[PDB]
Design a protein around this ligand. Structure first.
Ligand SMILES: [Mg+2]
Lengths: 586, 1340, 49
DNA sequence: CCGAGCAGCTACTTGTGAGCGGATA
DNA sequence: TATCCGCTCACAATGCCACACGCGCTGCTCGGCC
């Protein structure tokens, strides 16, 4: 059909045409020339050549390039035939049938919203206005404000003081859908109740971006509107963030807290030996919070307080028990957040990442889902507040270098020198020399890493009416690493201690390690070897993302051909599941 | 001694390595390339003479008519670069070649040619690069990146592993010429050797070897050795050397001279070889069953019967043995076969060779090349002789021949462009040897095997590509040309070569408009090496080998500067001190190291010569007299770091910056950062947007003092002189007497460019930084361009930054900012957008740019002028008609009387269509400039007249300053000459001599001198009038736009965009983030002194992403600011210059044994105050890439001021007003606003347009379109429930032609119920499949 | 959007899809190698009937 | 006249899978 | 004559966004219903 053929008047006498136009043109031309040749009774060779040319024209119109000679029409580029409009990632299936562009949609950069609740999110005022124009028009026509659509449109364009309340009312309980650009699992699209904010960015909850795998370094996400009663109810019932707290892959809660809140809570719970108010007595958590905010006492100090915990009985009963515990002021203050069902032993810890994860898991298991959302929200609020009030900061003096690192490095160089001497003596060959050097350097790196760890742990002595009470280290980098917030053991080892061994192009290990660290100056050749080893891993993901997308597409194409259509099959065959114990213990 | 701009504000520097090689010209690569391109070079070297002397001369088909080439010349560019930019024409130059047609009569092959026609002809124009290495094709400044490809020559690849799944390593030799047909020898899974020509059919190598008049015996003598068997009395003795039987077992009793040597079944060991060499015996006794395993070498003919006994490559059988013995041949030559030394490979190729003679060999190779068309022998030999031994279809360049001779271990390095039989023989021998085990493969992972080509080489290649077409044309036209019928001008057309050059410079995989947003991006884009484009790989088909960086990349290409994403490793940046070799390789400078002293000389080593010598450590602790403080030293022999002695070393690194790029050397404390963070920071620094007011970066690297001057961004001083006239638009300098030319000289004028649109919609503006009467030196900076400060690069801004969580507003990577930053006009930038309206010549009458816009009021037309264009400076925020474009729709011949009537009386103007261009809905700002171009012939509007009059007035002001200076000089001269008549001079020549030069007395000399001076005066006046008239004719000359257009108008809308939550900001260590929420000044934390902090980052981002150097930098900046504060306390409180000088000396004399060693007593005691005033904002600190200041140096610099040594200061909360425990660190960090502003990212659509091919909503931000519901989104949705949600998102909201309107009507009527309908695109697919020969149909 | 026309071809031609399917439909249906069918289609060798 | 159709002036991917000889018992 | 092997051809390789740009010339020959 003609209008389906791309042909539009461009600027001036030229028109933007399509390749199918030229295809049909040439086909009609060759057909007319063949008819003319047949009418004049052309020689057999002439009519056979014309028939061959017409066949070439028609089977290039069908599928150009399949015959072998990809003819071009303009710009010396391969021509687009009918088969090209269906195959590939640009055919109708991949571009205009499976994934189509939708209306009532928007796109904007993400931004941390730390005040909004887990079930809601932020939305720019102009974005919300441009998205819900029909709802605003309907609500204006409802009230005695706009009699027609033109008046409502003019008022929206002018954006008078009488339209903002309408926009607040239409988004009172109308959720929207937030979506990340690369979508991996069900959590790639979630539902959220929007609250209007003055700005051009989308404020997002911190505890869900982790499931989104969306960092705040400039990521842009999309927003969509349900537009239908059925759609709004489904988004509130199924796609809502509260209804998606367990990952569909593993039963682990996907709302595990992030680095900032867990660091705040670890600082709140990491008790010292001596501080302001060590050894006093407090009535309840409220009095502890009062004494802390008054400044008359510290945040972490061993204090005997009285807790009033609740235990769920066999039935739906919550038995109350009041008992005197000896805990830190931070745990007592945080106790005002946890619901009544949980015991006190879950707070009387250092409250690391795994600790808070298992706490949230136990809360969801015992108390269900309804209170778990508000529990996590209060957790995040208190964590942010107390991490801001704490003042966690990494500095040059915070990263300490082991004083005995130099002697270990000198012993290692003496060992490699005597190994080289043995090699020059003709006793040991090159392969065994390389192996010995590699294992000696690995042992030296392990020793220096253990030294760095035991150093970062010590030199924390505080006198509590005594002489020395060496405790857990309070170094900020150690607080960030040990709590599992952001830093790991290998990362802090590469940071403070020596980097260790690196790799060459083929994959082997170079015999000359990096005997320096990041805090200390790094040598030129050492940094060169380091960046050579790191570029491999950097390009790794950049190449592998395409293969991963292709694998996901193949897997979903194999999938989606089955649903749960029966309640029971009525069989007895299965599989003999047993814990695999191959290799190690299990 | 220091430069004047250094005396303005000298930057404190650290480091203890005194560099010996200064920073070379950052853009020297492309500049030298284009210089080699356009210049008269003898001996047909690189540039333009090579292609000419290769193609020219041309002879007709034995017609005694040759076309000779003499030379070429480049005319003056018809437009200055500023004119090309303000117009849109190319900054090109003509190419006038002086050719020579020599045609002679018939009946004389070598008859002396007469009637020679020597004529100059113009053949297209070539674009010339500016002084910054940029080409202007169509207004924009397009740059050509250099391409890294395979070096022409030979390579040996090793196919292993999954190759053929046979567990057999194969070795393939590849001969690749610079321009011509390829060649590939390879092996089968068996021991068979084959050869192919440009991926053709796999055929054995014996046929292509014998094609060059080669017989079997010749091939066998060349490849394999000869074993001699003698027909003795019995047993057929043979000659032996104890080295040929090494590694084989004795199948017989090897005994000679009546003494047993090796028993039957004993492997000949090394001791056996020594024993058999001690006696020096050659002839032994060998049995009969042993010769049957060998094979004869040459064909032995019989003399009794005259027949062949046995041919070559045929195993010998006892009957053949008896026949050859009875024939009489005593000496029989056989092959020496041994799997460890000479693996039998040519024998298999010979026994699988279907052809024997050269005739059938040539015809088979012709059939293999061209399918069908079986010619005779002389017709088929033409192809084989033209495709591999003709200088027109095989163009092995000088570097190709050099690499070919070096790979084959040959002394001479010169040769021809064509191949040779001995070269093929040698490469086949080398492949056989590398198969046998001798010799190793050359990996494609080597800069010695990868050749770099600049803009000049590809320009010459495209010139030759066009010249071959022009040559074919002139040859087919020379078939008719005879004597006395044509000049050597009509036979040459400019179309092919000019068009080829234009398309190569305008549209190619390498021609791209430069990212004009900061000098750093310019420098890193001109020093950009790509692997894509013609002759290079594709990012889609690149393996893990090209992406990885090699130890041979040391100092030749930066390993940390690479665009992360689709092309990691394919696009790199050249090293700092890297140079282009004459052959086209990457050379790195090294200091020669003698036995004890390291002399201060430099040698530019190549990539191949690296493994021969050893390179010393760059930052190795060295002693005086070129000595090392330690006997052992870190070195590298062949891409492997190791420990050597102080005397075995032979070369040292020239500096410590040659490893990192120019874009990476600006990263302070780079040694304390990880590779990933460093790469991300170096990539993000390229996208820095120039702020409204630049400011010196505190923690600098010293290199910034070069990138700002080596580029063409700032105003450089061509001649050092005294400042005469300072203005925001122009700067006029008076040249000093020495630097001034002894004749026709004057003063220099630099026309500063004002706010104009760049290639990235950014503002580019130069600001003067000099004062009147201030003397300047040659090369010094006069006006700071965009993002510069006193000849120093300044991309972002320095800010007071703390590292502590703040209520989660720095949750993961978000940035917190105070209102003080946005209030102080800190990060506010300017964006300039160009909007064009064209008056195309269509039928029914041409378009008009009048102001008579009907169907609209005056409010929408109030911003329009009398001509029909928006005023210069008229703001606009929404869709508003800013140009009155109208087009006729019906009848032409609207009488001008009726036109003016309609303008005053009557009805509206009918045929207008209201097609005027308005600004898109969403963009705001105030228009700052309007350009207009009228084709020669159309009536120029009065606005065009005003614009050209203003530019003429500017040019005339410049010319008037020039002429008035010259005239004042000439009048001083006339005053000096008429001193003899002094009384009349002083009485009637004070006021009126400026117009009454007419005088006369004492002819003999006075008349002569007065006439000479009047002649000089009138000649100067006439020359300046000619200059003014030429400038007027140039600026008034209408430029061509397009076939079928009247005039093109452009408007530049400039908008001031401030920082807001949503923008992207990053430091210099890869700590990117988005502004979370602007905070009030009271809410932000503040120190115990009262100074509020500006930025509050997240300290949690430091451990995982290992960029710790940034923290160091921060501390350093703190220290710097502290120094500045001291200076402020010294400036506000009026202090004597002595205390200030002493403090500055103590600051610059920090105890780190630095190489700066600046003194304050050498200053003029006046510029010290200006320097201190320039220091009150902080103390600029330089820091080498690897020789940066240590921790103790920063600690002592901090303790110099009253700042705490720990670097962490107690902070007070802005909200609660209490003390933050655990003292947070705080300092001054240099940050950058990325080119990812939110105002160009936020976008939404309720209901807009739809595509014409299918009724689907558009997207994007330029057009009012929504977003795309990707296939992964559909998968995620169907993984949930939401069946109705997907069903509405697919057709109701996007595709249903009759469903979306119904849904909108229901929603506006308060009805939230839908109708499924049918997706339109589904019907489109139905119709498309129905258009094919396939029938699809829906059932009931 | 839905109305279509047609072209009356003078010399009936084959459909390249059914001829280059690998395996092609005619190549298996007519028990004839695809090489001979292509030779006949491009007018360089007769086929008897 | 107008319009429309046609003629002279690419090869570093690698892999996987299927098909077509092909030659050897 | 089955059947494994070697050579040859079809098909495959994210996703989004932003910007920029672009379409063989001139000439020759044959054919159409106000
Ligand atoms: Mg990100």
């Amino acid at each position: 059909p003609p209008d389906l053929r791309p042909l539009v008047p461009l600027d001036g006498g030229r028109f933007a045409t399509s390749d199918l136009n030229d295809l049909y043109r040439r086909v009609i031309n060759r057909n007319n020339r063949l008819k003319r040749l047949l009418d004049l009774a052309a020689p057999d060779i002439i009519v056979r050549n014309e028939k061959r040319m017409l066949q070439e024209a028609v089977d290039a119109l069908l599928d150009n390039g399949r015959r072998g000679r990809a003819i071009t029409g303009s710009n010396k580029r391969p021509l687009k035939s009918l088969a090209d409009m269906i195959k590939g990632k640009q055919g109708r299936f991949r571009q205009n049938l499976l994934g189509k562009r939708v209306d009532y949609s928007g796109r904007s950069v993400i931004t941390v919203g730390p005040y909004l609740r887990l079930h809601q999110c932020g939305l720019p005022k102009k974005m919300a206005l441009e998205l819900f124009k029909p709802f605003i028009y309907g609500k204006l026509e409802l009230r005695g404000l706009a009699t027609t659509i033109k008046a409502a449109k003019k008022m929206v364009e002018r954006e008078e003081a009488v339209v903002w309340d309408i926009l607040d009312e239409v988004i009172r309980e109308h959720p929207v859908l937030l979506n990340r650009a690369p979508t991996l699992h069900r959590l790639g699209i979630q539902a959220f109740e929007p609250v209007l904010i003055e700005g051009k960015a989308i404020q997002l909850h911190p505890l869900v971006c982790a499931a989104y795998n969306a960092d705040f370094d400039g990521d842009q996400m999309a927003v969509h509107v349900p537009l239908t009663l059925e759609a709004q109810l489904e988004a509130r019932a199924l796609m809502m963030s509260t209804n998606n707290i367990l990952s569909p892959a593993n039963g682990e809660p996907i709302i595990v807290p992030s680095q900032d809140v867990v660091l705040g809570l670890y600082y709140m719970t990491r008790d010292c030996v001596n501080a302001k108010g060590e050894g006093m007595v407090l009535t309840g958590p409220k009095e502890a919070e009062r004494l802390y905010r008054s400044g008359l006492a510290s945040l972490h100090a061993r204090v005997k307080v009285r807790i009033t915990e609740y235990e769920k009985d066999a039935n739906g009963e919550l038995v109350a028990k009041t008992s005197l515990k000896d805990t830190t002021v931070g745990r007592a203050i945080l106790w005002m957040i946890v619901p009544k069902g949980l015991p006190y032993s879950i707070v009387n810890q250092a409250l690391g990442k795994k600790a808070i994860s298992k706490m949230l898991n136990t809360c969801y298991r015992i108390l269900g889902l309804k209170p778990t959302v508000i529990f996590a929200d209060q957790i995040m609020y208190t964590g942010f507040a107390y991490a801001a009030r704490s003042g966690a900061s990494v500095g040059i003096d915070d990263m300490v270098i082991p004083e005995k690192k130099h002697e270990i490095i000198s012993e290692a160089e003496a060992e490699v020198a005597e190994i080289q001497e043995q090699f020059q003596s003709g006793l040991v060959t090159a392969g065994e020399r390389y192996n010995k050097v590699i294992d000696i350097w690995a042992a030296a790196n392990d020793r220096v890493s253990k030294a760095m760890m035991d150093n970062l742990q010590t030199e924390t002595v505080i006198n509590r009416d005594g002489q020395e009470e060496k405790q857990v280290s309070f170094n900020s980098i150690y607080m960030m690493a040990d709590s599992g917030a952001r830093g790991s053991a290998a990362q802090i080892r590469q940071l403070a201690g020596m980097r260790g061994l690196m790799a060459k192009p083929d994959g082997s290990i170079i015999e000359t390690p990096i005997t320096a660290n990041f805090r200390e100056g790094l040598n030129v050749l050492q940094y060169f070897i380091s960046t050579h080893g790191a570029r491999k891993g950097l390009a790794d993901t950049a190449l592998k993302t395409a293969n991963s997308g292709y694998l996901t597409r193949r897997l979903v194409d194999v999938a989606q051909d089955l649903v749960v259509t029966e309640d029971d099959c009525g069989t007895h065959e299965g599989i003999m599941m047993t814990p695999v114990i191959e290799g190690g213990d299990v | 001694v220091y430069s004047y701009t250094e005396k303005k504000r000298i930057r404190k520097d650290f480091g203890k390595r005194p560099q010996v090689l200064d920073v070379p010209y950052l853009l020297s690569i492309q500049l030298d390339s284009f210089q080699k391109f356009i210049e008269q070079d003898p001996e047909g070297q690189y540039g333009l003479e090579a292609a000419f002397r290769s193609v020219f001369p041309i002879q007709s088909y034995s017609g005694n008519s040759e076309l000779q080439y003499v030379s070429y010349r480049l005319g003056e560019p018809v437009f200055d670069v500023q004119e090309c930019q303000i117009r849109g024409v190319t900054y090109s130059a003509p190419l006038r070649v002086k050719l020579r047609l020599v045609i002679y009569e018939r009946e004389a092959p070598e008859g002396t040619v007469k009637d020679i026609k020597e004529q100059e002809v113009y053949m297209g124009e070539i674009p010339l690069m500016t002084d910054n290495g940029t080409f202007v094709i169509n207004g924009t400044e397009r740059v050509i990146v250099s391409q890294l490809h395979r070096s022409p020559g030979v390579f040996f690849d090793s196919d292993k592993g999954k190759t053929h799944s046979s567990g057999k390593v194969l070795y393939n030799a590849r001969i690749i010429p610079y321009r011509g047909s390829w060649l590939d020898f390879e092996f089968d899974p068996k021991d068979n050797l084959f050869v192919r020509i440009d991926r053709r059919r796999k055929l054995p190598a014996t046929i292509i070897l014998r094609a060059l008049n080669y017989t079997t015996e010749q091939i066998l003598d060349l490849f394999f050795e000869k074993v001699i068997f003698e027909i003795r009395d019995n047993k057929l003795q043979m000659e032996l050397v104890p080295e040929r039987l090494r590694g084989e077992t004795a199948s017989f009793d090897i005994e000679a001279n009546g003494k047993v040597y090796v028993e039957k079944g004993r492997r000949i060991t090394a001791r056996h070889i020594r024993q058999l060499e001690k006696d020096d015996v050659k002839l032994i006794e060998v049995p009969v069953e042993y010769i049957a395993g060998k094979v004869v070498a040459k064909d032995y003919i019989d003399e009794s019967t005259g027949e062949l006994i046995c041919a070559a490559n045929m195993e010998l059988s006892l009957d053949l043995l008896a026949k050859l013995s009875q024939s009489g041949h005593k000496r029989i030559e056989t092959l020496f076969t041994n799997d460890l030394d000479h693996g039998p490979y040519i024998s298999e190729t010979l026994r699988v060779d279907p052809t024997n003679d050269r005739l059938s060999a040539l015809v088979e190779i012709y059939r293999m090349m061209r399918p069908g068309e079986p010619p005779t022998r002389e017709a088929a030999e033409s192809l084989f002789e033209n495709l591999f031994f003709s200088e027109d279809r095989y163009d092995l360049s000088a570097v190709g021949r050099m690499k070919f001779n070096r790979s084959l271990l040959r002394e001479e390095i010169e040769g021809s462009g064509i191949l040779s039989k001995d070269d093929i023989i040698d490469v086949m021998k080398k492949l056989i040897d590398i198969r046998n085990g001798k010799g190793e493969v050359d990996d494609i992972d080597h800069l010695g095997n990868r050749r770099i080509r600049s803009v000049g080489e590809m320009a010459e290649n495209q010139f030759r590509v066009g010249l071959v077409r022009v040559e074919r044309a002139v040859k087919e036209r020379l078939s008719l040309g005879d004597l006395d019928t044509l000049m050597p001008q009509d036979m040459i057309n400019a179309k092919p070569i000019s068009a080829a050059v234009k398309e190569f410079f305008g549209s190619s995989q390498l021609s791209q408009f430069m990212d004009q947003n900061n000098p750093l991006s310019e420098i890193t884009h001109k020093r950009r090496i790509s692997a894509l484009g013609p002759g290079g790989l594709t990012r889609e088909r690149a393996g893990f080998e090209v992406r990885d960086v090699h130890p041979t990349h040391y100092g030749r290409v930066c390993p940390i500067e690479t665009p992360e994403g689709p092309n990691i490793g394919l696009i790199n940046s050249l090293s700092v001190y890297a140079q282009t070799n004459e052959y086209g390789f990457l050379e790195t400078p090294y200091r020669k190291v003698t036995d004890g002293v390291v002399t201060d000389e430099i040698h530019y080593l190549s990539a191949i010569e690296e493994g021969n010598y050893v390179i010393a450590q760059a930052n190795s602790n060295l002693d005086e007299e070129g000595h090392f403080v330690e006997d052992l030293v870190t070195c590298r022999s062949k891409g492997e770091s190791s420990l050597f002695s102080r005397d075995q070393v032979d070369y040292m690194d020239v500096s410590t910056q040659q490893v990192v790029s120019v874009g990476a050397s600006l990263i302070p404390f780079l040694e304390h950062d990880d590779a990933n963070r460093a790469l991300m920071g170096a990539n993000m620094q390229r996208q820095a947007v120039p702020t409204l007011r630049a400011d010196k970066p505190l923690v600098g690297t010293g290199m910034e003092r070069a990138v700002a001057v080596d580029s063409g961004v700032t105003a450089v001083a061509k001649r050092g002189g005294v400042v005469q006239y300072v203005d925001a638009s122009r700067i006029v300098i008076k040249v000093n007497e020495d630097e001034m030319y002894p004749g026709e000289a004057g003063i220099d004028i630099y026309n500063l460019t004002k706010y104009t649109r760049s290639n990235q919609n950014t503002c580019i503006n130069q600001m003067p930084c000099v004062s009147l009467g201030e003397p300047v030196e040659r090369g010094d900076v006069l006006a700071d361009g965009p993002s510069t400060d006193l000849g120093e690069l300044a991309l972002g801004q320095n800010m007071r930054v703390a590292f502590m969580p703040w209520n989660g507003y720095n949750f993961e990577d978000s940035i917190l900012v105070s209102e003080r930053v946005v209030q102080e006009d800190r990060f506010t930038t300017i964006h300039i957008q160009e909007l064009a309206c064209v008056s195309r010549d269509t039928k029914l009458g041409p378009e008009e740019i009048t102001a008579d816009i009907p169907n609209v009021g005056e409010a929408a037309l109030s911003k329009l002028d009398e001509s029909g264009i928006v005023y210069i400076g008229a703001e606009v925020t929404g869709g508003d008609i800013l140009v009155g474009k109208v087009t006729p729709k019906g009848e032409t011949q609207l009488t001008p009387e009726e036109k003016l009537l309609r303008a005053i009386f009557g009805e509206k103007a009918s045929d207008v269509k209201d097609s005027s261009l308005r600004v898109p809905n969403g963009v705001s700002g105030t228009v700052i400039d309007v350009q207009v171009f009228t084709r020669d012939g159309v009536e120029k509007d009065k606005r065009a007249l005003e614009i050209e009059e203003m530019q003429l007035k500017q040019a005339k002001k410049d010319l008037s300053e020039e002429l008035q200076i010259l005239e004042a000089g000439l009048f001083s001269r006339i005053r000096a000459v008429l001193v003899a008549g002094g009384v009349e001079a002083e009485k009637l020549d004070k006021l009126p001599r400026d117009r009454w030069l007419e005088l006369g007395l004492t002819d003999e000399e006075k008349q002569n001198q007065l006439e000479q001076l009047a002649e000089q005066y009138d000649e100067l006046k006439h020359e300046f009038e000619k200059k003014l008239e030429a400038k007027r004719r140039k600026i008034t000359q209408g430029d061509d736009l397009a076939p079928g257009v009247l005039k093109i108008v452009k408007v530049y809308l400039a908008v001031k965009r401030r920082i807001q939550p949503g923008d992207k900001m990053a430091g210099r260590h890869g700590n990117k983030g988005v502004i979370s929420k602007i905070n009030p000044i009271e809410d932000m934390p503040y120190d115990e002194n009262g100074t509020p902090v500006d930025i509050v980052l997240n300290p949690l981002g430091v451990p995982s992403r290992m960029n710790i150097g940034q923290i160091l930098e921060t501390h350093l900046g703190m220290a710097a600011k502290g120094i500045g504060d001291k200076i402020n306390a010294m400036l506000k409180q009026q202090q004597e210059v002595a205390k200030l000088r002493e403090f500055i000396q103590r600051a610059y004399d920090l105890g780190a044994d630095v190489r700066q060693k600046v003194d304050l007593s050498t200053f003029s005691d006046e510029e010290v105050m200006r320097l201190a005033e320039n220091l009150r904002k902080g103390m600029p600190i330089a820091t080498p890439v690897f020789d940066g200041a240590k921790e103790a140096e920063i600690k002592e610099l901090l303790k110099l001021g009253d700042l705490p040594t720990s670097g962490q200061i107690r902070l007070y909360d802005g909200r609660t007003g209490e003390q933050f425990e655990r003292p947070v660190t705080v300092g001054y960090m240099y940050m950058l606003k990325l080119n990812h502003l939110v105002d160009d990212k936020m976008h939404a659509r309720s209901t807009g347009s739809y595509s014409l091919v299918t009724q689907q909503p558009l997207g994007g931000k330029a057009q009012f379109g929504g977003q795309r519901f990707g296939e992964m989104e559909v998968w995620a949705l169907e993984a949930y429930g939401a069946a109705y949600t997907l069903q509405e998102m697919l057709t109701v909201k996007s595709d249903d032609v009759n469903g979306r309107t119904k849904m909108y009507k229901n929603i506006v009527d308060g009805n939230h119920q839908m109708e499924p309908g049918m997706p339109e695109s589904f019907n489109v697919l139905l119709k498309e499949i129905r258009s094919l020969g396939i029938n699809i149909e829906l059932e009931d | 959007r839905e109305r279509m026309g047609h072209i009356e071809l003078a010399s009936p031609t084959a459909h390249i899809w059914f001829l280059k399917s690998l395996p092609s439909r005619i190549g298996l249906l007519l028990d004839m190698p695809l090489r001979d069918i292509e030779r006949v289609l491009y007018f360089e060798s007769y086929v008897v009937i």
